[PDB]
Amino acid sequence: YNVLPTTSLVLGKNQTLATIKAKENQLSQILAPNNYYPSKNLAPIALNAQDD
Amino acid sequence: GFSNSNSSTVAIDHSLSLAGERTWAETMGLNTADTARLNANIRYVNTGTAPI
């Protein structure tokens, strides 16, 4: 519950562009097992921010 | 011999001009206080015995 992944944009072999913690636009309240957030019929979410 | 003379010249002009110009320009601005931006690629290593 309250899923906030910490992810990383990487170029090339290991050239990391950025490391971003998921913000409140990117929060997932429930992630039950064998499921997706968001659901498979819906479109995936957008991450475009660096600020808190 | 004594020669007098007197002339009077009356003139008129029309004119066209077709001026075609192609201009190329290039500019490089800089601020000496903010020349460069940095980005580090780093890892964390635990050689200890307890986790942190």
Reported in sequence order, the residue ranges of A1-52 that DSSP labels E, i.e. its strands, are 6-11, 15-21
Between chain A and chain B, the number of residue pairs with CB atoms below 8 A apart is 3
Q: In the 8-state DSSP scheme, what is residue A44?
A: P
Please list every residue in chain A whose beta carbon sits closer than 8 Å to the beta carbon of residue B41. Answer: 14-16
Preferred mutation among A13, A16, A17 to probe B, highest tally of B CBs within 10 A: A16
Resolution of the solved structure (Å): 4.6
Within 10-39 of A, beta carbons closer than 8 Å to B belong to 14-16
* Closest C-alpha to A1, from A33, A25, A42: A33
d(CA B19, CA A25): 58
Tokens for A27, please give them.
């929060």
Place of tokens 């986790």: B51
